[PDB]
Design a protein around this ligand. Structure first.
Ligand SMILES: [Cl-]
Ligand SMILES: [Cl-]
Length: 407
């Protein structure tokens, strides 16, 4: 059947006249991943909007519009259409026209990426606003978007996973629930009735440490100390011996004034192996290399592998000139998105499931693993980010894991 839990049904009904909490100005759902909160939240938003207004404008925001469409709008579309709603997607325009029982409203899509994101939601007048991944958004974009919700009866809807305790959304919204007159429902995987006791426990084994506390337990816990505290040389390091690899990639972090790194990654029996590393530090050497010199080193680095098994070079986005040279030379290139927090989370998960393993010649990588830490002072201000020192192999690994194994 795939039935809804008690907590999911509250998301669907809170706003109705029969509900005790219908006068609340909005809702916040936070907590764990895979909790079946995102799709009910979005469905309930459209349902509430279509039932309460006609010919109004409504907002929907993600970290980017692309992500919003992937995470919410596409599954929301399919689900809306199956229960008698109709949808038109004005692609470039970035809004939807939704129709139900002779009523029509307009749903505008936004991205809340940076301090300029606030400038794109100044004109429009709104009867509601929905934020997916609000803990990934700037406070300024959310202050504006909420200020554009001027129509009488307007409600605010927030969906997120936890960040740190000092994060603005925890401090200004979740700790001020009665002040803002919002409802709050906290989800864990127990609220998702379609997951067995086995599958829930499998998801539990994908996370340890801070990311386990946030994405499984749903706790707003501070990031502190070693980032990859699940990395373990008893489990993640293997001998440097030949294996019959079926597929290869190279991942690259670029530096002229910082080190440049290559990692050769090789697939064997379901696991991607870091076969070796290249580590050129121009500062230590007292000699900087050019794009051409690094191209030459990269050709040496991949000499002894069959060209039909090499699937390309994953490159740090800022190395645009280097990418042009590689394409000019016939080398396939994939630009890494460089989504930092999601990449770090995904590297951690790759280690926990042993999706990756390292040859013991990757000695520079291992030195970075032992030193790569969270920015302590930033975390205590609400900003989760690494201290960007001795992370040149680790950034390349992240590009590889995040581009090929996730995404
Ligand atoms: Cl969800
Ligand atoms: Cl979030």
């Amino acid at each position: 059947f795939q039935p809804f839990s008690k907590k999911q049904l509250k998301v669907l009904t809170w706003w109705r006249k029969a509900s005790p909490v219908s006068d609340k100005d909005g809702i916040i759902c936070d907590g764990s991943i895979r909790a079946g909160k995102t799709i009910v939240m979005s469905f309930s938003y459209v349902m509430w909007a279509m039932d309460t207004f006609n010919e109004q404008n409504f907002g929907m925001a993600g970290k980017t519009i692309g992500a919003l469409r992937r995470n919410v709008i596409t599954p929301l579309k399919r689900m809306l259409k199956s229960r008698g709603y109709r949808v038109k997607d004005h692609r470039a325009d970035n809004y939807l026209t939704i129709t139900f029982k002779g009523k029509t409203n307009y749903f505008y899509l936004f991205g809340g990426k940076d301090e300029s994101s606030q400038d794109l939601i100044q004109g429009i007048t709104l009867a509601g606003m929905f934020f997916d991944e609000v803990a990934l958004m700037p406070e300024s974009f959310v202050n504006q978007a909420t200020a554009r919700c001027s129509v009488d009866g307007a409600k605010l809807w927030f969906n997120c996973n936890p960040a740190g305790p000092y994060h603005w959304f925890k401090v200004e919204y979740l700790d001020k629930l009665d002040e803002k007159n919002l409802l709050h429902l906290h989800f864990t995987m127990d609220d998702n009735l379609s997951l067995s006791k086995q599958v829930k426990e499998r998801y539990q084994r994908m996370y340890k440490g801070v990311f386990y506390q946030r994405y499984i337990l749903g706790l707003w816990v501070l990031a502190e100390g070693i980032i990859y505290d699940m990395f373990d040389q008893d489990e993640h390091v293997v001998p440097t011996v030949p294996r019959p690899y079926e597929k290869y990639y190279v991942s690259c972090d670029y530096g002229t004034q910082n080190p440049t790194t290559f990692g050769l990654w090789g697939l064997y029996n379901g696991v991607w192996y870091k076969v070796k590393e290249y580590h050129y530090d121009g500062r230590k050497e007292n000699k900087q290399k050019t794009d051409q010199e690094y191209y030459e080193d990269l050709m040496k680095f991949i000499e002894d592998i069959e060209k039909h098994k090499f699937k390309g070079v994953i490159v740090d986005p800022s190395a645009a000139s280097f990418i042009a040279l590689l394409r000019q030379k016939g080398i396939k290139v994939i630009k890494a998105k460089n989504d930092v927090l999601d990449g770090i989370r995904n590297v951690a998960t790759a280690l926990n499931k042993k999706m990756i393993l390292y040859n013991d010649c990757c000695k520079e990588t291992f030195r970075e693993y032992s030193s790569y830490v969270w920015d302590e002072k930033a975390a205590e201000r609400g900003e989760d980010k690494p201290v960007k020192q001795n992370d040149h192999q680790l950034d390349a690994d992240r590009y590889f894991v995040n581009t090929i194994l996730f995404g």
